[PDB]
Design a binder for these strands. Structure first.
Ligand SMILES: [Mg+2]
Ligand SMILES: [Mg+2]
Ligand SMILES: [Mg+2]
Ligand SMILES: [Mg+2]
Ligand SMILES: [Mg+2]
Ligand SMILES: [Mg+2]
Ligand SMILES: [Mg+2]
Ligand SMILES: [Mg+2]
Ligand SMILES: [Mg+2]
Ligand SMILES: [Mg+2]
Lengths: 180, 206, 261
RNA sequence: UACCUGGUUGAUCCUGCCAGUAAUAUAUGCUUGUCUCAAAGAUUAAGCCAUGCAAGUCUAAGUGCACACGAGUGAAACUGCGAAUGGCUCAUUAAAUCAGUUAUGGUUCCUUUGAUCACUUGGAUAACUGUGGCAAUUCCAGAGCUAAUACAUGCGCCGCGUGCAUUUAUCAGUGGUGACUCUAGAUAACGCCGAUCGCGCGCGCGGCGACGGUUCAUUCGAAUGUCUGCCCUAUCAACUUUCGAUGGUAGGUCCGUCGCCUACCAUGGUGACCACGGGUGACGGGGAAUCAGGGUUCGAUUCCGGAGAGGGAGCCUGAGAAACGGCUACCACAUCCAAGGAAGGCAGCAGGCGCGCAAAUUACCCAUUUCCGACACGGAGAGGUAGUGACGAAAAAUAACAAUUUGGAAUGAGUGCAUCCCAAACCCAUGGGCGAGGACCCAUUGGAGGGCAAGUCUGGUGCCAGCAGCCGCGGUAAUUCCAGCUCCAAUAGCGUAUGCUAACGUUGCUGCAGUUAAAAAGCUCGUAGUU
RNA sequence: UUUACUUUGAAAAAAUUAGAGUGUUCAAGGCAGGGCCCCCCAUUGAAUACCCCAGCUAGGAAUAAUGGAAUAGGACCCC
RNA sequence: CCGGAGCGAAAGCGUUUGCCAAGAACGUUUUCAUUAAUCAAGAACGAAAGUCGGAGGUUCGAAGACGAUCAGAUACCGUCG
RNA sequence: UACCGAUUGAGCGGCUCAGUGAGGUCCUCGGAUCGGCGCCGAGAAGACGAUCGAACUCGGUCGUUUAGAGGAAGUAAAAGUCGUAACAAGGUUUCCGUAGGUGAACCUGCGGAAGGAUCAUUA
RNA sequence: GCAGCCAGCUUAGAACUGUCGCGGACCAGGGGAAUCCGACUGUU
RNA sequence: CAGUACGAGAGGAACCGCGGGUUCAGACAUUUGGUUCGUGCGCUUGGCUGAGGAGCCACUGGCGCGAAGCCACCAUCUGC
């Protein structure tokens, strides 16, 4: 009898074929295109998409006049259009099945800061967040795997304490200054 | 100790069942009554819930009632004559429920003469010698003699019942549970129930 | 299994308390009292979680040890009092008069001052037991014993009794058309009007309750808690009597109000 | 993602299994810089245990002359209550536990809530003072005082009355029930009615509380039954009773029903729709893993219920225990003796031995969570926290921006102070400060013939040593082995062993097969079953 | 004549799972919080589904059984 | 004659005549009126060899003897049984 | 690697027949004793009987685990000896059932089967 | 449909009872596991 | 004696003294045990005297206990 949780779920799924020549390049292409650490992150976003596809799939099997499909279906749609992976015009569960892995990779924080020009390259965009620079509505984020929403997309900027923003410089800037 | 549980018996199919747990206290049992005939020996038993239970080991008096009439007088239990369960409850003189006994008839006649004013258990030929019995055959007031007339018209008891009044031993039956209640209450046989046990006593004593 | 149990795990507690699973292992086991353990709310929760006036379990003790709370006007000291249904919790030190009443769902709400109504309550009679020499008895809701009942009251009606004298003032007969607040799960807090009563010899009887917007359903006879004669209640109701806004309807109100604030 | 690939042959199409593949969970191998969570002596041994702890408890309110401190908190002490919960483990248990269902009209209760309900007489006694026994224990003995909330004390019948609890018998019909032999009424009869306490006024009084009893309540709950549902086994087919097996009568017994038991009678009850018997690496369930669907497997394991405390058995006390952190024996085991005796149960929390492939600290504290008692105060190894921890899970370094190698620029990990945090400490997290260019502050683990992504590379080892899950590689130019470089799914994880799931339509209900690849009884009759 | 079958509701522990709601910096999770100097998710939450089988509750009468009259102790009304 | 013809549940069944009681198919405006199909448990039958008890033992012929062949035949071949 | 195996097996373990039976409860009694004060009261040790029943000494039965001289197989090795049984007409067509016999595969009889080397052989 | 009468001798069950003793004398198989030989009964 | 002499150790004596025992010898019956036809007492089977009572019979009816005697390293005493 301990006051704990013991509730934890996995975020990735290892593929069936370990050395599928066609699959190895399709995941490696997503590595450099979005600047990912290893294949685990590819399988992670692939697993989140697989859950959303299966969640939308079981709803499409029910009748349209079912209140469970109407409520649970709209709630899934509102969350997809909230984060920006799906557009408000294509707000239907049929468009969920057409979502690809790159649709959720674009909503990644390290990619949004690259589309906004705050970073030089996609790999530097990871280090830009890894060094505690990017903030979202005065809330600084350190991990690059953050997902922004549409009501928070136009608030991605530098922190009030980062050298790239407005504040004190880094420790290397102050080190070379005192020695010169 | 003694237990009345069911997990020690065989199933309805005949297969032996293994005990799920050891003997529990809430299913305990205690020895049988075996209430003999003796003066005022009763033990108290603490039971489930802190209550009290009265264990009657030997009792000599019994609060029996009369069936035909409305009379409940405590009388001295003499002996047991027959028991439908087994003849062992009468060879050992054990007072239990639904056993026919031969109880005294002095309290029954004492109230019958004071209410009906009619000799019933008197010997055929002998008269009332003591003066206390002549007061039941005197002349009373107008408001007192009028009520005894309407009571004398309905007094012809069955001939099979008036015979026991001659010997002073009425065939009664313990209608209570002595070991549990602590009191050997009951009633007196009459009608068809009196003829049934008399036939069993006649066969057993024949 | 050797006798009575004196502990209550937090995950084993009734869901109507909404306790934090990451703070402790045990739930506040409500002290023995007038109400069932499954249909009550420990006095600590109502003072620490609902009202938030207590921060820990020792500070709520200081509430009862200073004689400020008083259920039905009688100051209690057990921080785990049942405080079941219709139990008026008046606070004369703070002027607040709470009644633990259910919401559209099954939960204990913070229903505030009802001074002119809090002086009494409603009680569901259970049985009509005959005492000595022909004196009937009535067992009320919160274990309050009332004697000398009217010969017209049955085992299903409701009565109102003042907190001081504890005498039956008025009663509401049970028939098709009386306002009711269904209790017993999946309808706890749904306020409606009784419409039908099915009879089952040897088992439970079925009754049908129709809410304000026509949300008619069915339930057992032992689930009726009459609260008003006809369609008018006696005591103040919380925000939403028995409307029971659906998941889609509750969704509409939350988005339309947050955008304005 | 509703997936397959190698291997029988000179070659081919098949049957078919082996092997390959991916999760899962135990162990183990090598490796391991950060953070947040988190399993953790279940598996073989419910084997055995050194030491310590885990239930005691005092308010203004049952009893208050330790002068230790000075009326009053007082330590001891007697009375009341708890210790029957929690925790631990899964040995036992196969209609049993358990789950749904529900019956008690077939049953009782501590605490709580609400009811209701003979001017205080009696004598000891503890602590203590004092005298002692035994080697020794939570051993006690003798005497002398001193307390109880311990213990004891408006009618029937016929002159003239007036509370009851229970047990039988009889009569009549207030509130009920689907249905009372119900609750009520009446007749004849047969241990409950307060000898108690606190902070506190007026002038024979009242208004505020506690404790406690009596039958009815309520509630926390227990206990016993109805209906339905358990894996494997027919090399278990009949089974149950000269000691109840099935039913009948009466009684005993228990809170109560009952073959629960006794006695008289009947020859019954169950069974191929699988009883009975046996096995289980069987506690049941909620659930877990894997799954297109259908399923397969797992559930000792924090919740619920049950079971047990070395094996049994039998009890005390209490409302509730057949209690073992309570007793009485026997059995097994074992400790101190002065050898007369005495005292033992860690499948409680740490720890030790043993067992093993297999599993942490004799750590800190009642603050949270709550629970127990005389209770705001006191107690809790229940619990909380920390250490150990690559069970497992979520985040996430080993560069980046530049140059054609050098410039700064950005940041912790680490390393040192405050604050926050915490019951205190601790991991963080934060504020500045101290902090990387072979940014040496450096990543390994299986591999590189095919299956199956990656070298006829380099050298020697020459059917030897070895490699290889399978097919297969070595008999002096080995793409396999013995090494480098390089390369590859990788990745702070990665191999290995075993269980199990998918693969497997190779258990086929969905959904397989039986002419020749494993296979329709030689043939027909025939009940149950199935249709 | 009554069953099997389908649909509805209460019941069919919590946790877990599915799953609405909430930017624990994200996530695993948790059941808790963005903003205006004592109001403001209209006295800030808040839901639901599933819970097989059996029993229970309210319809339908297809399928498959069963069954009411043949020595008519036949169904109805009489009288 | 005797056949890729019949019959029987199969194993199996062919000289004449006689006896005995069955059977499919067909015929039918007969009759009975769902009395069915398949079938764990159970049973009839079941070539041949073999086994026990009698008769008869022609031929064949396990075994066995012997004759031939072969490096060797404990066999095929031959006589006999 | 299992099986058979005298041993009149056996370390090993469960329900039970019949004995014996601690301990407790209960009952029938007993009356050491101290409170009255020479009778009513309380009352321990202890005992008869009943009942529950651990455990022990012998047996029956079931489950389960193991020793065994010796005997007889299977499989994996090297395929060493012998012969050629089978695969082409395998040189006697193969094979089934059954029986007997034989160093060995095998031979033979009887009845089969084609999985035969014949789907066929003439009025 | 039985009432009356007559007639024995066994069997079962129960209480009580004595020193747990009772087929009280008498009468009246020790048993089990194996080997050898002869089958057995019979005969010498 | 003595853990001593002796021995590097490991080991390890002897005389006097004390207390017992083996075998044997000679006794003996207080005790324990055996025997009992003192046929002593009790009980008891079958039978017999009509029964009770009291007895007898069954080559000592049987059983329990058993005196006196005799007797046992199976009890005890003594042995220079
Ligand atoms: Mg021999
Ligand atoms: Mg002979
Ligand atoms: Mg012979
Ligand atoms: Mg002979
Ligand atoms: Mg002698
Ligand atoms: Mg005689
Ligand atoms: Mg005589
Ligand atoms: Mg003679
Ligand atoms: Mg003789
Ligand atoms: Mg003798």
């Amino acid at each position: 009898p301990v006051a704990k949780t013991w509730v934890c779920s996995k975020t990735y799924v290892t593929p069936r074929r370990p050395f599928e020549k066609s699959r190895l390049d399709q995941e490696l292409r997503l590595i450099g295109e979005y600047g990912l650490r290893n294949k685990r992150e590819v399988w992670r976003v692939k697993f989140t998409l697989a859950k959303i596809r299966k969640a939308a799939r079981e709803l499409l099997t029910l009748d349209e006049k079912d209140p469970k499909r109407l409520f649970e279906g709209n709630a899934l749609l509102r969350r997809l259009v909230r984060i920006g992976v799906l557009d408000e015009g294509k707000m239907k569960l049929d468009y969920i099945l057409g979502l690809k892995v790159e649709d959720f990779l674009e909503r990644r924080l390290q990619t949004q800061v690259f589309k906004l020009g705050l970073a030089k390259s996609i790999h530097h965009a990871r280090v830009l967040i890894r060094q505690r620079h990017i903030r979202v509505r005065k809330q600084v984020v350190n991990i690059p795997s953050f997902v922004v929403r549409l009501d928070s997309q136009k608030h991605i900027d530098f922190s009030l304490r980062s050298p790239y923003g407005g504040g004190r410089p880094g420790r290397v800037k102050r080190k070379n200054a005192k020695k010169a | 100790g003694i237990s009345r549980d069911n997990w020690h018996k065989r199933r309805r199919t005949g297969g032996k069942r293994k005990p799920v747990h050891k003997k529990r206290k809430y299913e305990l049992g205690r020895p049988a009554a075996n209430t003999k005939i003796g003066p005022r020996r009763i033990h108290t038993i603490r039971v489930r819930g802190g209550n009290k239970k009265y264990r009657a080991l030997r009792l000599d008096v019994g609060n029996f009632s009369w069936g035909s009439e409305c009379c409940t007088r405590k009388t001295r239990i003499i002996d047991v004559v027959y028991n439908a369960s087994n003849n062992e409850l009468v060879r050992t003189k054990t007072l239990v429920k639904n056993c026919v006994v031969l109880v005294d008839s002095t309290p029954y006649r004492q109230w019958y003469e004071s209410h009906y004013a009619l000799p019933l258990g008197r010997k055929k030929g002998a008269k009332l010698t003591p003066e206390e019995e002549e007061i039941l055959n005197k002349k009373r007031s107008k408001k007192v003699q009028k009520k005894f007339t309407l009571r004398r018209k309905t007094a012809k008891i069955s001939p099979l019942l008036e015979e026991q009044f001659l010997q002073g031993k009425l065939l009664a039956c313990i209608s209570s549970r002595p070991g549990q209640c602590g009191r050997a209450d009951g009633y007196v046989l009459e009608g068809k129930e009196l003829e049934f046990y008399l036939r069993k006593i006649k066969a057993k004593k024949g | 299994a050797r006798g009575p149990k004196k502990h209550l795990k937090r995950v084993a507690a009734p869901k109507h308390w909404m306790l934090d699973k990451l703070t402790g292992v045990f739930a506040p086991r409500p002290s023995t009292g007038p109400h069932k353990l499954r249909e009550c709310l420990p006095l600590i929760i109502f003072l620490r979680n609902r009202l938030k006036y207590a921060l820990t379990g020792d500070e709520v003790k200081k509430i009862c040890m200073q004689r400020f709370i008083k259920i039905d006007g009688k100051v209690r000291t057990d921080i785990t009092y049942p405080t079941g249904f219709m139990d008026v919790v008046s606070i004369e030190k703070t002027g607040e008069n709470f009644r633990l009443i259910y919401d559209v769902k099954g939960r204990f709400t913070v229903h505030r001052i009802t001074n002119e109504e809090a002086k009494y309550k409603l009680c569901k009679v259970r049985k009509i037991l005959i005492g000595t020499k022909g004196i009937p008895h009535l067992v009320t809701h919160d274990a309050r014993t009332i004697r000398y009942p009217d010969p017209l009251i049955k085992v299903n009606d409701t009565i109102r009794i003042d907190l001081d004298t504890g005498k039956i003032t008025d009663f509401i007969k049970f028939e098709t058309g009386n306002m009711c607040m269904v209790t017993g799960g999946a309808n706890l807090g749904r306020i409606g009007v009784i419409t039908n009563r099915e009879k089952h010899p040897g088992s439970f009887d079925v009754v049908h309750v129709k809410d304000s917007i026509g949300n008619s359903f069915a339930t057992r006879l032992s689930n009726i808690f009459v609260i008003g004669k006809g369609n008018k209640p006696w005591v103040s109701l919380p925000r939403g009597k028995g409307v029971r806004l659906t998941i889609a309807e509750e969704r509409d109100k939350r988005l339309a109000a947050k955008q304005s604030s």
